[PDB]
Structure formats: C-alpha cells, structure tokens
Paper text:
Structurally, the 35 kDa OCP consists of an N-terminal domain (NTD) composed entirely of α-helices and a mixed α/β-type C-terminal domain (CTD) of about equal size, both encapsulating a single ketocarotenoid molecule in a common central cavity. By exposing the chromophore to the terminally emitting pigments of the PBSs, OCPR acts as an efficient quencher of PBS fluorescence, protecting the underlying photosystems from the deleterious effects of overexcitation and dissipating the electronic excitation energy into heat.
To this end, we used a recently evolved orthogonal pair consisting of a custom-tailored Methanosarcina mazei pyrrolysine tRNA synthetase (MmPylRS) and its cognate tRNA to replace Trp288 in OCP with 3-benzothienyl-L-alanine (BTA), an isostructural analogue of tryptophan in which the imino nitrogen is substituted by a sulphur atom. The resulting OCP-W288_BTA protein is photoactive and, according to the X-ray crystal structure solved at 1.8 Å resolution, fully isomorphous to the wild-type protein, allowing us to parametrize the consequences of the absence of a single H-bond by spectroscopic, thermodynamic and computational methods. As expected, the overall structure is very similar to the wild-type OCP, with RMSD values of 0.180 Å and 0.203 Å for monomer and dimer alignments at the Cα-positions, respectively. In addition, the distance between Tyr201 and the keto oxygen of ECN and is almost identical at 2.5 Å compared to 2.6 Å in wild-type OCP.
Numbering used by the authors: 2 to 314
Write the structure that this text describes.
C-alpha cells in the first residue's frame, strides 16, 4: 500500500522553501505592468552581483521569429505584447510562447532585456513606481537567498503566455549527446552507497537520460521543486530531455532507511547548479528517494530547502 501521492510524505521533517510558491502567488495577483517593472528591477539589481549565462544558440534561433516580430512593432504594441504575456492573454504570440520549454522562454526574455537596455524595444517607463502590493513582493524577493530568487524569476517566466487547454505541440531545445564515458565524474555521498541513487546522480550529471530512465519503475514518478509528480517513464523521460539538460548535482550526505514492503527510503542533501548561473548560485537541495525491493525508483522528490541550516548536519 504505497502510492505516488502517499510517497510524497516521506521524510516529512524536510523543510522546503515554500516562501517561493508563496511569493509567486503574491506576484501573480499584481497588475501586469507592475509584474514587468518588478522583474525588471529585481533582474537589474540581481545582475550587479550574479552574472547570467548567455542563452544557447539553438534556443535563441527557436525564439528568433517571435523576437523579430516584437522588434518590428511600434513601442506601444511592444509594451502591449509584454503585458499580454504577463496577463496570460490569448494571442498568437502568447500561444507560441506557451508552447516553448522553460529555457526557450528564458532566452526570449534575456534578449528582450538586452534590447530594452539598449532602447531598441520599449523599456519600462522611467521613474515607474510600483503598487503597494508590488513593492512588498519585490522586497520579499530581495530578501531571499539567491537560489530562491532565481527560482522565483524562472517560475514567473514559465507562468507567462497562454497555455490554457495546452497538451498540444511542445517546442524544446535539441537533446545534447550524453557525456562521453571516459570524462564522466562520479559523485560521493557521505553515508549513502546505494547504487541506484549514485547512478541517478551520475547519469543526470552526464545528460545520459536513456540510462537514467531505466532506473525508474514503469509507473514511477519524479517531483520537481514545488511541482506535482511527473508520472510514468514516458513523461519523466520527456521532462528530462526538455528541461533537465546541463545540470550539476553536488550531493553531500544522506541517510538510508527501510520502508514498508521491502522498500527503501533514502534522503540526500547537497547543492545543485543550473547552467544559467553555474558555480555562482548553489541551490540548497534535498533528494527523497523511494526504491522498491529491486532497487528501482518508485518515487523521487527534489526539494528546494528553506536555508542552508536544513542541509543534513
Ligand atoms: C521576465 C522579464 C525579464 C527577464 C528576466 C530574465 C532574463 C530572467 C531569467 C532568470 C533565470 C535564467 C533563472 C534561472 C533559473 C533556473 C533554475 C531555478 C533551475 C533550477 C534547477 C533545478 C532545481 C534542477 C532540479 C532537478 C534535479 C537536480 C534532478 O535531479 C531532477 C531534475 C530536476 C530539474 C528536478 C526582464 C528583465 C526583461 C523584465 C521584464 C520581465 O518580465
Ligand atoms: Cl536549468
């Protein structure tokens, strides 16, 4: 008697940074022009100390057409297209944007940000003043750990556009070939020698998604931070290929415990780096694995932890 939804409760002591979804919820109530101005301010300040990596060439080619169209617009239509995105309005641009994977959306906005700084796309009005709720939301963001700040930014970007009733076409970056076997690193985890867990981390660090997916049970699931579980090999594999490329998992230590019915539950804590920021932002992460008797992954959750004080010991 162990289901995906019940497995979500293992290691319930684990204190996730639920300020992140809380802040996204407050952010999403705001006026669209405040949403845009708020991210503009946060992004400008964050950039004084955090350098964002340039978008990949393939991603920028996929966003090029939409970026060209916006550039050909007059300033008022440019501002209107950005508000449409933030409002999740139903427009052709908003539907194109909603078909994109997160990295393509992120590179789209990265490039609009550069063009706004250069004055080639309508900027945020000079001297713009946020609303009462918006100033408070921005203050909250600026008080978070950098790992939490960039999660808020990405989740806000992913939220934009019109994805209503959208199980249709998905546009994503091409799949990078797995790291050659001779150059792959091998993680070490204090306390944890489980082969499934170590192979999980090593294969993801090598972008070896075909090998990684075979560690899962047919009906197994993966739960990203603050998102519902992704269920089944088909869906988990799609997620890997479209959204999980070029991560760096740096686990540190863990604990291994029996679970009901010859299962095993393992919790590991450490850091994860996104290619957007590399070593400049280390996110505090827990991994919560539920393995069946054969060692297959029935459930794995990845949690963004509330602070470094939540890392094991
Ligand atoms: C929008 C906008 C702007 C632009 C703003 C811009 C350019 C914003 C860009 C912000 C960027 C690029 C943020 C990068 C975020 C990446 C994160 C949080 C990834 C974490 C990865 C994790 C947790 C991986 C976890 C994983 C592990 C380890 C697994 O083991 C399994 C897989 C899994 C994935 C779960 C302007 C500046 C133009 C202003 C207007 C405006 O609105
Ligand atoms: Cl990423």
């Amino acid at each position: 008697p162990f289901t995906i939804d019940s497995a979500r409760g293992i290691f319930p002591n684990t204190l996730a940074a639920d300020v992140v979804p809380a802040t996204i919820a407050r952010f999403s109530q705001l006026n669209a022009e405040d949403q845009l101005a708020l991210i503009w301010f946060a992004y400008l300040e964050m950039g004084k100390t955090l350098t964002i990596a340039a978008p990949g060439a393939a991603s920028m080619q996929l966003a090029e057409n939409a970026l060209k169209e916006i550039q050909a617009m007059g300033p008022l239509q440019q501002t209107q297209a950005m508000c449409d995105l933030a409002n999740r309005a139903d427009t052709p641009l908003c539907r194109t944007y909603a078909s994109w994977s997160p990295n393509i959306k992120l590179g789209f906005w990265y490039r609009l940000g550069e063009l706004m700084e250069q004055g080639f796309v309508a900027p945020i009005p000079a001297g713009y003043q946020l609303s009462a709720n918006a100033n408070a939301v921005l203050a909250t963001i600026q008080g978070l750990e950098s790992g939490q700040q960039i999660t808020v930014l990405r989740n806000a970007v992913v939220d934009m556009g019109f994805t209503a009733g959208k199980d249709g076409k998905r546009i994503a970056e091409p799949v990078v070939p797995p790291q050659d076997t001779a150059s792959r690193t091998k993680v070490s985890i204090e306390g944890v020698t489980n082969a499934t867990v170590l192979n999980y981390m090593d294969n993801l660090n090598a972008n070896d998604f075909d090998t990684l997916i075979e560690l899962f049970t047919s009906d197994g699931a993966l739960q990203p931070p603050f998102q519902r579980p992704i269920v089944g090999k088909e869906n988990v594999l799609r997620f890997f290929r479209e959204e999980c490329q070029n991560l760096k998992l740096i686990p540190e230590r863990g604990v291994t415990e029996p679970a009901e019915d010859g299962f095993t539950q393992i919790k590991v804590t450490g850091k994860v780096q996104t290619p957007w920021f590399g070593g400049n932002v280390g996110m505090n992460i827990a991994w919560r694995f539920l393995l069946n008797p054969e060692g297959k992954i029935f459930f794995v959750a990845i949690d963004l932890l509330a602070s470094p004080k939540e890392l094991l010991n």
